[PDB]
Design a protein around this ligand. Structure first.
Ligand SMILES: CC(C)=CCC/C(C)=C/CC/C(C)=C/CO
Ligand SMILES: CC(C)=CCC/C(C)=C/CC/C(C)=C\CO
Ligand SMILES: CC(C)=CCC/C(C)=C/CO
Length: 195
């Protein structure tokens, strides 16, 4: 027994395994359904342009991030890890989140162009905003903050800038991307005295 919303969630999760081979397409969705033992006809629950699969992927990545940040916070509470200052915390959080893209990196510029279509932009912006909100919550944010916008605008700019750099990066294990991110974070957290 399971609801329709749950059923569609499970199919789209399974479809992700096939995006590397087939792109953000109905074909990936149909392979996902079949990999679960359902009919390929279950792809007909979804559109053809890939928007639902991509938005599903972004949401899932944001959920995985919060679970990672929760786990890391628990290590801190048990005395197994140091509490990181904000610059290192943010660098690690953005890296954790962007690494989730590595298996899909050849397809990620295409996904970004689809997330920017007019009918997707409100949802893509909500998801970005929720992501940076979450990151700041675990970085130690207070419920009430006069710097609410500045913090989120800055962190969104670091994230998106680094994402663009990563789509050009051929260095081993994206070395050059994480060095860029480190510099962007260090400069944003100490903007008054940057080079
Ligand atoms: C603020 C503008 C103009 C674009 C950002 C919206 C966008 C392209 C989001 C892509 C997906 C993303 C970065 C998700 C993070 O949760
Ligand atoms: C690759 C495509 C089609 C779009 C790039 C995604 C965006 C919106 C990048 C701009 C984000 C940025 C560099 C800073 C925050 O606005
Ligand atoms: C774009 C901003 C600042 C917030 C997301 C818009 C919104 C309230 C969506 C409801 O799901």
């Amino acid at each position: 027994y399971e609801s329709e919303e749950q059923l569609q969630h499970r199919i789209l999760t399974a479809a992700l395994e096939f995006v590397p081979a087939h792109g953000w397409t109905a074909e990936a969705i149909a392979e996902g359904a079949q990999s679960l033992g359902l009919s390929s006809a279950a792809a007909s629950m979804f559109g053809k342009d890939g928007s639902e699969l991509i938005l599903h992927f972004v949401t899932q990545c944001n959920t995985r991030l919060t679970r990672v940040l929760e786990e890391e916070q628990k290590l801190v509470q048990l005395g197994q890890a140091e509490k990181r200052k904000t610059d290192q915390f943010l660098r690690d959080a953005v890296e954790t989140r962007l690494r989730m893209l590595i298996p899909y990196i050849e397809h990620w510029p295409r996904a970004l162009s689809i997330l920017m279509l007019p009918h997707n932009i409100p949802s893509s912006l909500s998801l970005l905003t929720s992501m940076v909100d979450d990151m700041w919550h675990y970085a130690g944010d207070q419920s009430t903050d006069f710097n609410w916008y500045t913090r989120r605008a800055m962190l969104a700019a670091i994230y998106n800038t680094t994402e663009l750099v990563m789509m050009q990066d051929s260095s081993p294990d994206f070395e050059d991307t994480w060095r860029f991110l480190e510099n962007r974070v260090n400069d944003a957290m100490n903007m008054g005295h940057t080079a």
